[PDB]
Amino acid sequence: VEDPKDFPSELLSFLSHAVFSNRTLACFAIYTTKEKAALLYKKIMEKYSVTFISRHNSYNHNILFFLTPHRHRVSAINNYAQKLCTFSFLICKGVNKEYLMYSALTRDPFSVIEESLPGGLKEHDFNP
Amino acid sequence: VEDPKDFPSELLSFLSHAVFSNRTLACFAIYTTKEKAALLYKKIMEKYSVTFISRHNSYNHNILFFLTPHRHRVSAINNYAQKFSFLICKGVNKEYLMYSALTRDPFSVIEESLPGGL
Numbered sequence: 001v002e003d004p005k006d007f008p009s010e011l012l013s014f015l016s017h018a019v020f021s022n023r024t025l026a027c028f029a030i031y032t033t034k035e036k037a038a039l040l041y042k043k044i045m046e047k048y049s050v051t052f053i054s055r056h057n058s059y060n061h062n063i064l065f066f067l068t069p070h071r072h073r074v075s076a077i078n079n080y081a082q083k084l085c086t087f088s089f090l091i092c093k094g095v096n097k098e099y100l101m102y103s104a105l106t107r108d109p110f111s112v113i114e115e116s117l118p119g120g121l122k123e124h125d126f127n128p
Numbered sequence: 129v130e131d132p133k134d135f136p137s138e139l140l141s142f143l144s145h146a147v148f149s150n151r152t153l154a155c156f157a158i159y160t161t162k163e164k165a166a167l168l169y170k171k172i173m174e175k176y177s178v179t180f181i182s183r184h185n186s187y188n189h190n191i192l193f194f195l196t197p198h199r200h201r202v203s204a205i206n207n208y209a210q211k212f213s214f215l216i217c218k219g220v221n222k223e224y225l226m227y228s229a230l231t232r233d234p235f236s237v238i239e240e241s242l243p244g245g246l
Contacts, residue, residue: 026147051149067148098147117150127147127203127217 003089007031008058011104014097019078024071027098030064030081031091037062040081045116047080048072054115056105062113065095065102099123131214135159136186136234142226144202144219152199153219157226158192160215165190168209173241175208176200182240184230190238193220193227 007015007029015029030040041055044066053066078092095101102121106112112120135143135157143157158168169183172194181194206217220226227246231237237245 026145051146051151067146069146069149071145121148124207125148125201125203127149127206 004031004061004091006091007063007093008109010109011063011101014095014101014104016074016094016096019074019093021075021094022073023094024073025094026068026071027095027101028066028068028072028074028077029093029095029101031058031089032062032064032081032085033088034060034062036085036088036090037064039084040064041114043084044077044081048077050116052116052121054102054105054120055113057111057113059109063105063110065105066116067098098128099126132159132189132216135191135216135218138234139191139226139229142220142222142229144221146202149202149219151219152201154196154199155220155223155226156194156196156200156202156205156217157220158209158215158217159186160189160192160209161213162188162190164213164215165192168192169239172209176205178241180240180242180246182227182230182245183238184235185238186235191230191235193230194241195223 037055045053048068051067051069056063074092074094081090081092165183173181176196178194179197184191202219209215209217
């Protein structure tokens with residue numbers, strides 16, 4: 001067993017795969033170890049003043065999903081993540097299907113561990 | 129060709145770009161077609177008791193700008209507007225600059241709720 005080279009297949013359809021793109025987004029997701037996830041959970045929340053950020057169980061690892069106040073290039077959300085994150089796999093990408101990504105993160109095979117707004121988000125709150 | 133994805137780059141600075149927020153505001157702006165813009169001018173005026181609302185010529189399309197006496201979630205405004213043409217609804221952070229820009233070439237006003245605007 002090596003480390004994931006990308007997010008689980010189930011989610012791939014809701015994410016952008018141009019991690020080098022110059023496009024900017026406000027929704028992001030990170031695939032990394034449990035311990036790092038929990039740490040990036042507090043860090044990212046502060047760093048980008050997230051409007052929402054959730055941590056999810058994902059096959060022995062974790063997935064952070066978060067919404068930002070401003071727009072950024074997946075490029076800079078990755079540099080920051082990596083910075084404080086050696087010796088640990090870390091996969092970062094922008095989300096195109098915001099609601100779909102999160103909602104899927106609340107259902108099997110996934111499940112929430114914690115989230116900035118207990119209660120979670122509903123589809124109509126999104127302004128894609 | 130696909131419909132627009134954002135407001136004209138020349139205005140992005142004055143706007144809020146969260147696709148998810150619990151922040152409420154009293155100034156919004158909609159980027160859609162000329163016909164939809166017209167419908168909405170009246171509809172939006174009534175629905176949110178705007179204190180001021182203006183509709184400007186963008187290029188092929190139109191941009192609607194208004195201020196509210198009370199605050200709402202951009203999402204709530206958007207949900208209302210959506211109910212087939214493209215439509216982009218967003219909060220405005222720098223209200224004056226935003227309305228000012230919409231009154232200069234390229235842009236111009238078609239109709240506003242206050243003679244002279246701002």
